[PDB]
Design a protein around this ligand. Structure first.
Ligand SMILES: COc1cc(C(=O)c2cc(O)cc(F)c2)cc([N+](=O)[O-])c1O
Ligand SMILES: COc1cc(C(=O)c2cc(O)cc(F)c2)cc([N+](=O)[O-])c1O
Lengths: 116, 116, 116, 116
């Protein structure tokens, strides 16, 4: 699995479950093309978005629907979403974990990139 | 001043100076409309982006050019940029400080929202 | 003012007001010696802890009473406190801002160190 | 495994490997008693610190030797270490993951607490 996303809740100290996200890849015409989508599991993780063969070099965007997560808990959060945009596989294939740690008025995000 | 952005560097322990950013407002057709731009000062801050009369309710986006910042320091970055998207003034005008704490493979962002 | 502490609340999107903290200097026998204390202002800041002549080289600890902060807001916290330990002035006097961004189950801390 | 620690490097986007840490438990006399120790693996994780039977209610401290990690990379970091202090198992047994995300002048820490 070359691309995995993990989302955590900093208020309750838990995985952020059932968080929707969409992944896009930048095309030759510089537009954003849909690439994959899914929702986080009970562990806060979303696996199985792509394969090594499909996940070619390019600029990718992960848009995480953090607002709907908070709204379902009764909270009106600051951010409309959390977007993570990055170039992938520019030096050959790598495995990417994108993590996001959520609070109502803040988020952190980090990438763990490993060589298979 | 209703909108200020502050950027810090977690590698050097310093303000992030000369970081460029652009601010957009969401248009009726879901496109991003130019609104303001600037670069951070020696204190890591960008002031004077808008006025209280111009800064009406709506969805706003701040795109911070973190990649150029790290490249100018000779450090390899992960992200293409750091985007912050939020709805402003939905409960009356507020003063917004958007802060971003930058590392090459991670960033944090938070909002400090105060009522004058 | 060579040492300032700023505390922010990631749940409310606000300065963390009335947060108590104590500062210690490490003694020759490896024990922590009282140095200063205070509580954050309406801007989340605590100034005036020491003077340039008193703030000599050494190892310092700031213990921030985050648990009492969250309890006073009726929110369950994870940590007993947030401690920041650092060596000061090892390359000449600097001005230190210690910042902490608080959530109930997470915190971030960073230092902004500038040379006058 | 009721207590696990994970350490990540925000500069390189990688696990922080071979990071030493010591865990302490507060005794009846309010002193810190050694509880466990270890170093992070190639995945940045330290498992096997304790058992459900031994990991009784109490206040625990994890002291992560972040300074030695940075110094081995040639870097003089801000913090002497990163300490995480928390009450555990006050409402019955739980499983704790303590994570720390490291930069030279900043760290973040969060807890994921689950019910077995
Ligand atoms: C309101 O203005 C400021 C905001 C902030 C932060 O948001 C912050 C963000 C983080 O991820 C971690 C942290 F410890 C602080 C830091 C400083 N500072 O240090 O000067 C400010 O003046
Ligand atoms: C990629 O794997 C993980 C990443 C992360 C973070 O990004 C993280 C973010 C922060 O602001 C602070 C922190 F201490 C960790 C947290 C966990 N975790 O808790 O299990 C992971 O497994």
């Amino acid at each position: 699995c070359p691309l995995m996303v993990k989302v955590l809740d900093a208020v309750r100290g838990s995985p952020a479950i059932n968080v929707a996200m969409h992944v896009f890849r930048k095309a030759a015409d510089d537009t954003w093309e849909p690439f994959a989508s899914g929702k986080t599991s009970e562990s806060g993780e979303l696996h199985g978005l792509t394969t090594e063969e499909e996940f070619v070099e390019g600029i990718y965007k992960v848009e995480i629907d953090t607002k709907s997560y908070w709204k379902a808990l009764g909270i009106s959060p600051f951010h409309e979403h959390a977007e993570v945009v990055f170039t992938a596989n520019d030096s050959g294939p790598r495995r990417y974990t994108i993590a996001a740690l959520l609070s109502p008025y803040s988020y952190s995000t980090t990438a763990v990139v490993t060589n298979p």
